Design a protein around this ligand. Structure first.
Ligand SMILES: C=CC[C@H]1COc2cc(C(N)=O)cc3nc(NC(=O)c4cc(C)nn4CC)n1c23
Ligand SMILES: C=CC[C@H]1COc2cc(C(N)=O)cc3nc(NC(=O)c4cc(C)nn4CC)n1c23
Ligand SMILES: [Ca+2]
Ligand SMILES: [Ca+2]
Lengths: 177, 177
């Protein structure tokens, strides 16, 4: 009994597979402007945050003040937000970012006593979710190429620096291959 | 590997558990009017349709012309629709009705070739979903008492008559206990 299996398949089939194809176009269009305006470029991939502690805040800035909402991505109804990543008060990147909502379900199950679902169980299933979703996106037609999973365990950490590491690696890959 | 486990837990934790508590109040309020007006009474339970063939139409009337949209249930934002059930053109009942959306995910997986998910697999998981969701609602605090699962296999059938059978049984139970 592993709720993570079905959560990952549902998150892909009922959301990712539907949004990613429109996403690529929406981002190119936005980038025409963003370029001419802020001489910036928004990454073409959806960045999905996977905190293994299953903590999804109501606003990204609360999880890290260097992640600041910039703009909503326009439609060609799906809502998506562009964020800027700061270093020393200066802009270091911009991207479409959001948390994997299924993890909220895992968190809630660990607080629902009838479930018998411990924090240990929650962490094990959060990792299994990440692994399963990765497998799915690896086999998926083009859709996978439109996003990147960012899974991280916080110690007992700079989320913005983690996102920037991926964004800089993505740019490196783009120009080299 | 059973996606039905996680689908049922997600459907409960991320939708049912959140809507049912408001539901009871919304329905009582509506029933004040519906009574004074059409001398009718809307059942206090959410009826969830579970076609085992995982066929979810865009409109109920297309699945059965004797199921006719009557009104949207008001808010105390969650959208819910009240339907009337017809017999010989005459109204035989009214209730809040909707399909279990997770089944759409099962249908889509059976059409997604990379999944290796056959129709046999789809039916097995649709039944497992129904059984798991039933177990959850049986152990759930009060929430279960606000809805009823209607699972049915169509031959190779009157959906409105199936819903009415449940509505009439619910009324019988209400007055006797
Ligand atoms: C029922 C339809 C909701 C779908 C489609 O519309 C959506 C729009 C936006 C947006 N940013 O505007 C986000 C979003 N997120 C989900 N759904 C899951 O995240 C999810 C988690 C699990 C587990 N399974 N699912 C798919 C049902 N949806 C959506
Ligand atoms: C992401 C948030 C969407 C939530 C909350 O808002 C909703 C409102 C209405 C309405 N009638 O107005 C229907 C509905 N249906 C789902 N969600 C699933 O049906 C579902 C299937 C599986 C599997 N897991 N989930 C929960 C995410 N939601 C909602
Ligand atoms: Ca955290
Ligand atoms: Ca059918």
């Amino acid at each position: 009994f592993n709720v993570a299996h079905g959560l990952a398949w549902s998150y892909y089939i009922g959301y990712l597979r539907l949004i990613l194809p429109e996403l690529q176009a929406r981002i190119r269009t936005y980038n025409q402007h963003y370029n001419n305006l802020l001489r910036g470029a928004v990454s073409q991939r959806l960045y999905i945050l996977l905190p293994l502690d299953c903590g999804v805040p109501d606003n990204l800035s609360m999880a890290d003040p260097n992640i600041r909402f910039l703009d909503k991505l326009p439609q060609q109804v799906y809502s998506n937000s562009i964020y800027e990543l700061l270093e020393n008060g200066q802009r270091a990147g911009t991207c479409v970012l959001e948390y994997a909502t299924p993890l909220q379900t895992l968190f809630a199950m660990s607080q629902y006593s009838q479930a018998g679902f411990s924090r240990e169980d929650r962490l094990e299933q959060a990792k299994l979710f990440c692994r399963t979703l990765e497998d799915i996106l690896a086999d998926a037609p083009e859709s996978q190429n439109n996003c990147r999973l960012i899974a991280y365990q916080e110690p007992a950490f700079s989320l913005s620096q983690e996102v920037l590491r991926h964004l800089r690696q993505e740019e490196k890959e783009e120009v080299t291959v």
